[PDB]
Amino acid sequence: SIVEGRTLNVAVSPASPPMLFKSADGKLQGIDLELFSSYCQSRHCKLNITEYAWDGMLGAVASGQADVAFSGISITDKRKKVIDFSEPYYINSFYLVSMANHKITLNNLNELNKYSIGYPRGMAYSDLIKNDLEPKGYYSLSKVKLYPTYNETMADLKNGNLDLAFIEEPVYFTFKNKKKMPIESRYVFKNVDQLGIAFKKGSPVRDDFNLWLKEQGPQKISGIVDSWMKA
């Protein structure tokens, strides 16, 4: 094996519940950590985990500083040029979210330009906008408000400085159902995205992780993913 017994540099940016986040305690938790941990246990590998800001985590795996990155990372065309991904473990949707008392009715995408839209800097919402909204004049990157993390985006939503937050589905349900934030989706881009584990370009670990996913099989992997979303 060129995979077994190795120590892997792992980059994380743990502010994407339930994929990766920190308990009240301060310990890393979530779907990505449970998947990649079991993989490491099967292959007798150790993780050397560094926390970065989001840009830092993507930068580290894209330069090959990190062997692996995970925190609910979307598999995008732009990222695949510099990063290899596992098979997707979740089929993902992007919501446009307002405060529940702010009644934004969105009939179609011609209505978006009226509003400020905000989300974390370096996230895949930028690609959706650049590729699918901007060319038809529905919105432009230059109107967008960018934030360090989902927490800061949410702080501006809550105080009224941001009309709409762009939030992926599992994170939305965390905020709404588990944190009980009084927020409401106004528009859903359904199944537009896919979440995977990221690997430095060329890494055999990507191929062996995919194999491990398939050793487990789809019932076990969905089980794992749903467990954290049912929690």
Q: How was this structure determined?
A: X-ray
**Resolution to one decimal, Å:** 2.1
CA dihedral for 116, 80, 14, 226, sign (positive or negative): positive
CA atoms within 13 A on the CB side of 1: 11
Assess contact for 83 and 199: CB atoms under 8 A: yes
Any idea what DSSP says for residue 15? -
Nearest-angstrom CA–CA distance, 205 and 86:
9
Taking alpha carbons only, the member of 189, 166, 185, 187 closest to residue 177 is 185
Q: Do domains 1-93+193-231 and 94-192 have the same CATH topology?
A: yes
Architecture of 94-192 per CATH?
Answer: 3-Layer(aba) Sandwich (3.40)
- Give yes or no for a contact between 50 and 180, defined as CB atoms under 8 angstroms apart: no
Nearest in space to 87 (alpha carbons), one of 8, 194, 228 = 194
Kindly tell me the number of DSSP H helices and DSSP E strands found in the chain: 8, 11
Among the four given CATH numbers 3.20.20.60, 3.30.70.100, 3.40.190.10, 3.30.300.210, the one describing domain 1-93+193-231: 3.40.190.10
Pull the structure tokens for residue 67.
């062997």
Listed by start position, the domains of the chain span 1-93+193-231, 94-192
Annotated binding site: 72, 74, 79, 124, 168
Return the amino acid letter for 85.
F
Rounded CA separation 167/125 (Å):
9
Residue 121 to residues 42, 53, 109, 129: CA-CA distances in angstroms? 35, 10, 22, 13
- Residues flagged as binding site for D-alanine: 72, 74, 79, 124, 168
CA 197/CA 164 separation, integer angstroms: 28
